[PDB]
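Hi support team,

I'm filing this because I wasn't sure whether my run with calcium ion finished correctly. The job status page said complete, but I'd like someone to confirm that the output block is well-formed before I use it downstream. Pasting the exact inputs I used:
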Amino acid sequence: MKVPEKIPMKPLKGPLYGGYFRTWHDKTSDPAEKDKVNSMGELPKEVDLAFVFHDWTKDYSLFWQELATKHVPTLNKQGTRVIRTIPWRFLAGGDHSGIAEDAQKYPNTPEGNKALAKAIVDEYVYKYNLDGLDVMIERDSIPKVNKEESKEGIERSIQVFEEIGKLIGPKGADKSRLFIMDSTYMADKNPLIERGAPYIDLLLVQVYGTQGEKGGFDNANHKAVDTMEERWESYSKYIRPEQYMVGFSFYEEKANSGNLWYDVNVEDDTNPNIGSEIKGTRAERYAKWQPKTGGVKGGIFSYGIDRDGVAHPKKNGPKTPDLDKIVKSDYKVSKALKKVMENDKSYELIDQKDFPDKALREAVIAQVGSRRGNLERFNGTLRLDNPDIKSLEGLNKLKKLAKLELIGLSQITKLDSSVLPENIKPTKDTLVSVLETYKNDDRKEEAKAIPQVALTISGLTGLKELNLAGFDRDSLAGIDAASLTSLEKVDLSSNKLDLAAGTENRQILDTMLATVTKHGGVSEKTFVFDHQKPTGLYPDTYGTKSLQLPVANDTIDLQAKLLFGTVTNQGTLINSEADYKAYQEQEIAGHRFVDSSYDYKAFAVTYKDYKIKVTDSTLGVTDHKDLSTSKEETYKVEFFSPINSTKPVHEAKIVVGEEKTMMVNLAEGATIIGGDADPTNAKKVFDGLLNNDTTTLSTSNKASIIFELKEPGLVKHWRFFNDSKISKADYIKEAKLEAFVGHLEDSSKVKDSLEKSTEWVTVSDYSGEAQEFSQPLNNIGAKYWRITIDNKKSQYGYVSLPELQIIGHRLPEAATVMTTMAAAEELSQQKDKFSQEQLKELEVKVAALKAALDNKMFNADTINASFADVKAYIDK
Ligand SMILES: [Ca+2]
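And here is everything the job wrote out:
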């Protein structure tokens, strides 16, 4: 076989129509059976990408013979690229992987994977001098071994996919060949896009039928998921809009349920050619669809393009299989769809009408796009640095620009709305989507806010007039006023500017003022700025984090004393209402700039629905907005926004009377050493959460848990909770807390047996139907604990325990500190071989250790000092 050299071809210029031709429908493959009448080489000019989709069961040696020698030159002359389609599998190996099945010749090694990539390109692209490679990524193509997903194979495919990428495509050694990814996944569930995106020319998404167009439906929230715009946005961070192509499907002969997409016209006896009519179908809708941002899409494609012109059936209608017969396609659907996209507003050419200044056009084509759908969709940054610009006419046609940069445009005289993007001011999306929508959907409903373009101006030495009135700009940043030397008339009115004190807006405003007045032009009609309505923000920080209080009788409002204020973008805190009355009267040159209209209640943010969490030193928490200083504590005060219930916007430190150190829960996430309670439910007794609606039960009627503190400490308090209001009298009624005397560890090899059967010390036992029982503990420095509970109900009483806290200070070696003290109240008890005052000297160095362990301002270093003192005196 001699294969011709590639016919020379134009570069691709969109929009693009692709089509998957199935090899068993070429009359050279299996004509006595499947197909006698169709041929891939008959594809029209309107097809830009002809995809060879092959049944790998079978050889069709005459097809590949006919493809390389006759079909490819024919298609290339009309300008149609021929793309080979291979499965995901082929890049992994194992269980129908084509070339990669030769695991010995191409082992899963860094150099074997480079070898497999070269073999893939040669075998599937170069052998027949095709125009590119298409790897489709879906469930039918997923890497498998013995019919089971290969996480190994998927991971390997990511390595071969980019070895292919540096062989062919935009980053490869042969950029004439195209590298294409075809998929059904949204980027999140495409394991191959992120490393693979830099390596591909085009990206195709298979979105057939209703669910492709409208997306999936979330039955719970009653909205659409995985929509067209959602699917585009998922991929929008890996590709450019011109790389995106969407696919519909033709009716595959003898297709079964699931593969009935209804993307083309349904049968109608009275119109034998209704398929080949294209208006009103999903294929046309897809041809017309354009993402609302970024830019216009690259085109569309079709699966089973050999079936072009066959109408869909509909199942609950006629059982007649008269459509499953194979006929010859005139490809009228494909031609019509290609012409729809080319005669579309979106793909019109940006020309003299839009930007007559050509240096401005050549700066718009290259940074926005060559087509008008991009002015109404582009999403990013347009810098204008070419000084040869004579006129900024047409930027008003940019509708969604993110950032306009005016740099060194000396020859530009005036700035107004007509020479700025429409989203200099608040606007909403004017584009109406083309797709059918879910009929029971509550999403969308309204137009979307188009964010306001950031404007940067520096170097316009010929700018005289600058008008941004009524544009609702939040700030003036990006304007280097110190280089706008020609300024004569200026207007910044009816915006949201701060322009006060040392706000950077003022530095800009005053710098312009000097220039305008140095021209001799302060006159009110020139340089105006009034009627500003600065937006009020929540302060990024809050200043007061401590307040010392006496011991008296009051009810202090924590919010009014700790959480207040409103900030601007330029940074102006107004903690009190009076501050604003001083703000409104701040003046330029004798002129108020804050609108009369705008009151404190409109500017200040509201802490109305904010909520509180005040924790005492014993680790107890209430939810009340006002504190009683009647008795002495040290507190911890946190404030939470309604935006997030568990991330504090402000933390404070209240000290009523003398400071008390803040104790910790030594028991959080403690590990269940034993007991008789449910292990998966018992671990939630220490998950640092009270209202465990995650089912915080333990047994039927009487339970016990043996647990180990992660970090042994100095225990001085505990509390435990019952199932909120979630229950009535199921409330625990008896509870027994025990600790372990270290030495009694019978056989330290095990931990469960030597404790479930041994001797313990009862540190507290309790009786009552109380809601939250809290109590101090006479020291205790144990590591292994036991809790026993009982709701005094019958068998099958299902006792629960939401949260138990073993509360104290973390002091390492606390046991030994307590047993050495124990060995000290030992010795001072007897008088043998103790002088009267020699004992006295010991008894003081004992209570000095006691008093250190009891000073509520826990000083670990000092406790350890007094311990080493008492421990050494026990040594002698
Ligand atoms: Ca809990």
